[PDB]
């Protein structure tokens, strides 16, 4: 796997620029997976998840 | 795996620039997984999760 | 695994620049996993988690 | 694993620059995992966690 | 594992620069895990935790 | 000029969130006014300038 | 000028959150005004300038 | 000028959170005004300048 | 100028949180005004300058 | 100028938190004004300068 050159960007995240203004907000969770941010994950080789919430299990 | 060159960025996160202004906010959690930040994870080789909340288990 | 060159950034997080202004906020947690910060994890080789909250277990 | 060159940053976190201004805030936790800071972990080889809160156990 | 060169930063945290101004704040914890600081951990090889709060055990 | 109420924002700038990545750049100035930043001025009552570069004067 | 109420922000700058990554850069100035930063000025009552570079004068 | 109330922020700068990474840089100045920082000035009543570089005078 | 209340911030600078990493840098100045820091000035009433570099005078 | 209340911050600077890492650097000055630090001046009433470098005078 000989490489030469000047660059090779594999799996990056490099620009995100964000602004949020939420005046009022409230969350009620029974069972439990709520993702309400920005979440800038990035990776190269994966065997099962990049990001997730996954909601697994009994709730009454 | 011979490499030469000038760079190789594998799995990075390098730009995120954020601004949030939330006037009022409240969370009620029964069961328990709530992610409401910025969360800038980044990695190279993974065997099961990059980020998560995962919600696993009995709740009554 | 011979390498030469000038650099190789594997799994980094190197730009995050954040500003939050939350006037009022309150959290009530029964069961217990709430992540509401910035959370800048980063790593290279993983066998099960990058970040998490994980919500595991009985709650009545 | 012969290496030469000029650098190789593996698993770093090197830019985070943050400002928070939260006027009022309060947390009530029964069960116990709440992470609301900045949390700049970073590492190289892992066998189970990068950061966590983990919510494990019976609560009535 | 012969290495030569000019540097190799493995698992560092080297930029964090923070400012917090929280006018009023209060925490009530029954069960006991609350992390609300800055938390700049960093390490090289791990077999189970980078940082944690862990919430384990019976509470009535 | 009696005022009551809950707020009145007069002349503010309160969201700007920016990311620039300029690989190479060079400036040659004879006469002298070059503004190439972000420049977030803001004000309330003015008698002649908000921002400027102004280019005034003899050059040979 | 009786005022009552809960707030009045006059001339503020309160959100700017920036990230720049300039690999190479060079400036040559004859005459002399170059502003290439972030420049977050803010003010209330002014009689002639908010920010400036102004380029005034003979150059040969 | 009777005032009452709960606050009045006049001319502030209170959020700036910045990160710069400039690998190489050089400046050559003949005549002399170069501002390449962050520059967070802020003020209330002014009679002629908020910030400046001003470039004034003969150069050969 | 009777005032009452709970606060009044006039001309402040109270959040700046910065990180710079400049690998190589050099400046050559003939004539002499170069500002390349952070520069957090702030004031209340002014009769001529908030910050400056000012470039004034003959140079050959 | 009767005042009452709970506070009034006039001309302050109270948050700056900085990190610089400059690997190599050199300055050559003929004429003489170079400011490359942090420079946190702050004041209340002024009749001519907040900070400065001022570049005044003949140079050959």
Distance CA C52, CA H23 (A): 34
Q: Do chains I and B touch (3 or more CB pairs under 8 A)?
A: no
Q: Is I26 exposed, middle or buried (0-12, 13-18, 19+ CB in 10 A)?
A: middle
Task: Determine contact, residues J5/I3, Cβ cutoff 8 Å.
Answer: yes
**CA dist A20 to A11, F7, G12, Å?**
26, 20, 19
Distance CA A12, CA J1 (A): 59
CB neighbours of residue A43 within 10 Å = 28
Q: How many helices and strands in chain B, by DSSP H and E?
A: 0, 4
Task: Determine contact, residues I55/H55, Cβ cutoff 8 Å.
Answer: yes
Residue whose C-alpha is closest to residue I22's, from I37, I9, I8:
I37
Distance CA H50, CA F50 (A): 10
β-strand partners of J59 = I59
DSSP designation for F46: -
Residue whose C-alpha is closest to residue H50's, from A46, I31, G41, J51:
G41
Task: Determine contact, residues H51/G39, Cβ cutoff 8 Å.
Answer: yes
Residue H13, SS3 per DSSP: strand
Neighboring chain I residues of D6 at a CB cutoff of 8 Å: none
How close H21 comes to chain C (CA, Å)?
9
Distance CA G19, CA J17 (A): 16
Q: Any binding-site annotation on E50?
A: no
Distance CA D22, CA E22 (A): 5
Distance CA J29, CA H53 (A): 18
Distance CA F35, CA F22 (A): 15
Only one residue has tokens 């709730």, namely A59
Distance CA H59, CA J60 (A): 10
Distance CA H44, CA A38 (A): 36
Only one residue has tokens 């700017």, namely G16
Distance CA F46, CA C49 (A): 55
Residue whose C-alpha is closest to residue B36's, from D53, H3, A36, D32:
A36
Distance CA A9, CA B10 (A): 6
Only one residue has tokens 């997730």, namely A52
Question: Are D55 and B41 within 8 A, CB to CB?
Answer: no
Q: How many CA atoms lie within 13 A of B54 on its CB side?
A: 26
Q: Do chains C and J touch (3 or more CB pairs under 8 A)?
A: no
**CA dist A45 to A50, C27, H6, H27, J42, Å?**
10, 36, 54, 42, 51
Distance CA E50, CA E57 (A): 21
Task: Determine contact, residues G29/I30, Cβ cutoff 8 Å.
Answer: no
Which structure tokens are listed for G14?
């309160």
CA R_g for chain F: 18
Q: How many CB pairs under 8 A join F and G?
A: 238
Distance CA E59, CA E44 (A): 35
Residue whose C-alpha is closest to residue D42's, from A15, C9, A7:
C9
DSSP string, H1-60: --B-SS---EEEE---EEEE--SEEEEEEES--EE-S------SB-SS-SS-----S-B-
Q: How many CA atoms lie within 13 A of H30 on its CB side?
A: 15
Q: Is H5 exposed, middle or buried (0-12, 13-18, 19+ CB in 10 A)?
A: buried
DSSP designation for A25: E
Distance CA F41, CA F38 (A): 9
Residues 6+ apart with CB under 8 A from C4: B2, B3, B4, B5, D4, D5
Q: Which residues of H10-45 are buried (b: 16+ CB within 10 A; e: fewer)?
A: bbbbbbbbbbbbbbbbbbbbbbbbbbbbbbbbbbbb
Q: Which backbone phi and psi does D57 adopt, to 5 degrees?
A: 130, 160
Distance CA D56, CA D36 (A): 19
Q: Which residues of F11-34 are buried (b: 16+ CB within 10 A; e: fewer)?
A: bbbbbbbbbbeeeeeeeebbbbbb
Residue whose C-alpha is closest to residue H51's, from I53, J33, A41:
I53
Chains meeting J at 3+ CB pairs closer than 8 A? Answer: E, H, I
Task: Determine contact, residues H33/F53, Cβ cutoff 8 Å.
Answer: no
Q: Do chains E and G touch (3 or more CB pairs under 8 A)?
A: no
How close C54 comes to chain H (CA, Å)?
32
Residue B46, SS3 per DSSP: coil
Residues 6+ apart with CB under 8 A from D52: C49, C51, C52, C53, C54, E49, E50, E51, E52, E53, E54
Residue whose C-alpha is closest to residue D60's, from C56, E57, A33, C35:
E57
Residues 6+ apart with CB under 8 A from B20: A19, A20, A21, A22, C19, C20, C21, C22
Which structure tokens are listed for H34?
């170069």
Angle at D20 between CA D19 and CA D25, to 5 degrees: 170
How close F58 comes to chain G (CA, Å)?
5
Which structure tokens are listed for F9?
């924002």
Please state the three-class secondary structure of E1-60 as a single string: CCECCCCCCECCCCCCEEEECCCEEEEEEECCCEECCCCCCCCCECCCCCCCCCCCCCEC
> H33 — contact with chain J (CB < 8 Å)?
yes
Neighboring chain G residues of B16 at a CB cutoff of 8 Å: 19
Neighboring chain B residues of G15 at a CB cutoff of 8 Å: 19, 21
Distance CA H45, CA H40 (A): 16
Distance CA I53, CA I41 (A): 13
Cα F18 versus chain centre, distance? 15
Residue whose C-alpha is closest to residue G57's, from G34, G30, G37:
G30
Task: Determine contact, residues J14/I42, Cβ cutoff 8 Å.
Answer: no
Only one residue has tokens 């966590």, namely D52
β-strand partners of J35 = I35
Neighboring chain A residues of F19 at a CB cutoff of 8 Å: 15-17
Residues 6+ apart with CB under 8 A from E38: D37, D38, D39, D40, E16, E18
Distance CA I58, CA G39 (A): 28
Sheet holding F10-13, edge to edge: F10-13, G10-13, H10-13, I10-13, J10-13
Sheet holding A34-35, edge to edge: A34-35, B34-35, C34-35, D34-35, E34-35
Residue whose C-alpha is closest to residue A40's, from G16, E26, G19:
G19
β-strand partners of D25 = C25, E25
Cα H57 versus chain centre, distance? 22
Task: Determine contact, residues C25/B28, Cβ cutoff 8 Å.
Answer: no
Q: Which backbone phi and psi does B49 adopt, to 5 degrees?
A: -170, 140
Residue J26 belongs to domain spanning: 1-60
Distance CA B52, CA B43 (A): 14
Chains meeting A at 3+ CB pairs closer than 8 A? Answer: B, C, F
Question: Are D17 and I21 within 8 A, CB to CB?
Answer: no
Distance CA J50, CA J13 (A): 13
Which structure tokens are listed for C16?
């995050």
H or E, element range at F20: strand F17-20
Largest pairwise CA distance in chain I: 58
Residues 6+ apart with CB under 8 A from J13: I12, I13, I14, I40, I41, I42, J40, J41, J42
Task: Determine contact, residues A16/B15, Cβ cutoff 8 Å.
Answer: yes
**Domain total in chain B:** 1
How close G11 comes to chain C (CA, Å)?
18
**Which conformational region is residue D50 in: left (phi greater than 0), alpha (psi within -120 to 50 degrees), or beta?**
alpha
> H28 — contact with chain C (CB < 8 Å)?
no
Please state the three-class secondary structure of I1-60 as a single string: CCECCCCCCEEEECCCEEEEEEEEEEEEEECCCEECCCCCCCCCECCCCCCCCCCCCCEC
């Amino acid at each position: 796997v000989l490489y030469v050159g000047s660059k090779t960007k594999e799996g990056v995240v490099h620009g995100v620029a964000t602004v949020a203004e939420k005046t009022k907000e409230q969350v009620t969770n029974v069972g439990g997976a709520v993702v309400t941010g920005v979440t800038a994950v990035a990776q190269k080789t994966v065997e099962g998840a990049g990001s997730i919430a996954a909601a697994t299990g009994f709730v009454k």
